[PDB]
Ligand binder design. Structure first.
Ligand code: FMN
Ligand code: FMN
Lengths: 305, 304
């Protein structure tokens, strides 16, 4: 039987649902080019601030048997750099491009969005706004109101994980007020875990006394929960999954929970962009064994008891 | 060299830091007896409500490669039952006893505490109050209400927090209450969703498959919370809970700041015999590292 990983959304066609997670292998020109050349369906640029940032002292990332911990500190080449990539360099013939934005204040987001507008219009780059801010529902509302007010396009929002239905309801209520928010990416890292190495009797990253965001196998059930929670509560919007994807089977779970696109962080950091060839092959293999032809056939169809 | 896992706190001596996590293998008389007969340093009774509760429909617990997911729904024998165990049955000669309380309202906790007071005085049972803790005003009000009617030290079981603003706010509140002498970190990571790829379904019945996560999933979160409160509440002790399967895991809890170490998922899967293994393993770890007592490394995790 004929089978396809194609995704159609945001006025774009994607060969497959896979892309990098913001922050992973998408900071430099070489990384952005490598992502574009890869088998991924899309890519997103490193979350940017108005000016270049060095980020936190090293070590600031550690791979772990069950995932990763990091406190990168937003090291990035600055907004001008990513805007120029989107405007002059990216080959839109190959795949669509998302640009991740993480201003350190409302003002910074407003000023960057005003400049992004023209490039989105002319080239088709799509904004993923990083709110992970989102544990303060008032700050989240203010951020979104400001961006919505000045940015004349649809966009998406990258969310931190929530852990109770009251939070899911409060966040969904806010997101649903903004028609321009067309996708929601669930999730950013599980915040402020602490990895201790028994051998060294020490933490494993330098910033913040060793506290850092968790990714990888640790976060998969939390990611699936958030994907599904917002899938249910925001029926007018698309959900992008992010968290714990190492295999085609993991990706299948994201889609079953409601994901349209599937982002890959920790596993990509460890394996490099060749991972996308493996993931597409594996996801097709999973669909073959389960007798599915397209993603629409099972997206959001997780069975409850 | 002579080693010791002894812990001394709240006017009690504990043979070792290990105990069950509230909710795991401590609902029935049979379970409470088995925990008392085990090699554990202590035990805590199932979180209780004023009256018995049947809990949520089954399946409501599932063991997983990396831990567990559950939505039990507070199935418990009711406060009178656990009070009677504490008052009339428990052999305090064997080990100290904690009683976990989880009223569904502030008034319920107040009324239970008024009655617990006399038994705490007479027999020495220690309250672990299951916290409402994502709402700091509510938490302060609850602790005020309980403190007013309960003339003893007690501890609080906390959900995990995920940022320093929350660690700071929670710590500030707990520090307002001198009667709160220990903080247990952590309860489950809330409302995860496990999906079985084979069945294309969730694995528990209540709440559309959403449930609390325990086990390997939660260890770095538990360590973070243990250490965050260890640092911010220097006048209190911290009890660790989350992701303990081995003596090495316990070693990490203690390095982060834990005095007692609670075992949930791993105990559910292995039974009370786990405590013999854990005491043996922790002593092995300590011998390899040349530590004789837990005081020598409690809270001493090195930062970079
Ligand atoms: C080294 C590193 C850098 C990251 N940078 C960003 C970032 O700039 N913006 C962002 O929204 N998320 C960032 N994240 C979070 C990832 O996008 C992703 O949400 C998280 O790692 C969970 O996915 P995973 O389990 O596939 O790693 C970063 C994660 C890592 C490990
Ligand atoms: C089946 C089950 C029942 C539980 N019941 C309670 C409870 O009644 N009160 C409570 O404070 N925590 C309860 N918990 C949470 C545990 O006490 C513990 O905080 C959590 O499982 C993390 O520890 P672990 O990683 O060792 O499982 C329960 C956990 C499980 C799996």
């Amino acid at each position: 039987g004929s089978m396809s990983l194609q995704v159609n959304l945001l006025n774009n066609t994607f060969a497959n649902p896979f892309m990098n997670a913001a922050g992973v292998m998408c900071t430099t020109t070489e990384e952005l080019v490598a992502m574009t050349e890869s088998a991924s369906g899309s890519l997103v640029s490193k979350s940017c601030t108005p000016a270049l940032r060095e980020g936190n002292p090293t070590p600031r990332y550690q791979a772990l048997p069950l995932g990763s911990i990091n406190s990168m500190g937003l090291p990035n080449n600055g907004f001008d750099f990513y805007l120029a990539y989107a405007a002059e360099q990216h080959d839109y013939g190959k795949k669509p491009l998302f640009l991740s934005m993480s201003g350190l204040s409302m003002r910074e987001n407003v000023e960057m969005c005003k400049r992004l507008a023209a490039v989105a219009t002319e080239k088709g780059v799509i904004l993923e706004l990083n709110l992970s801010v989102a544990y303060d529902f008032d700050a989240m509302r203010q951020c979104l109101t400001a961006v919505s007010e000045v940015y004349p396009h649809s966009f998406g929002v990258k969310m931190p994980p929530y852990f109770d239905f009251a939070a899911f309801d409060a966040a969904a209520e806010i997101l649903n007020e903004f028609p321009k928010v067309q996708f929601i990416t669930c999730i950013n890292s599980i915040g402020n875990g602490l990895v201790i190495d028994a051998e060294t009797e020490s933490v494993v990253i330098k910033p913040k006394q060793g506290f850092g965001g968790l990714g990888g196998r640790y976060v998969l059930p939390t990611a699936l929960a958030n994907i599904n929670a917002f899938y249910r509560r925001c029926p007018g919007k698309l959900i992008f999954g992010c968290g714990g994807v190492y295999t085609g089977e993991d990706a299948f779970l994201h889609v079953l929970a409601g994901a349209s696109m599937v982002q890959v962080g920790t596993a990509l950091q460890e394996e490099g962009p060749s991972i996308f060839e493996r993931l597409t092959s594996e996801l097709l293999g999973v669909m073959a064994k389960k007798r599915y032809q397209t993603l629409d056939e099972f997206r959001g169809k997780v069975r409850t008891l």
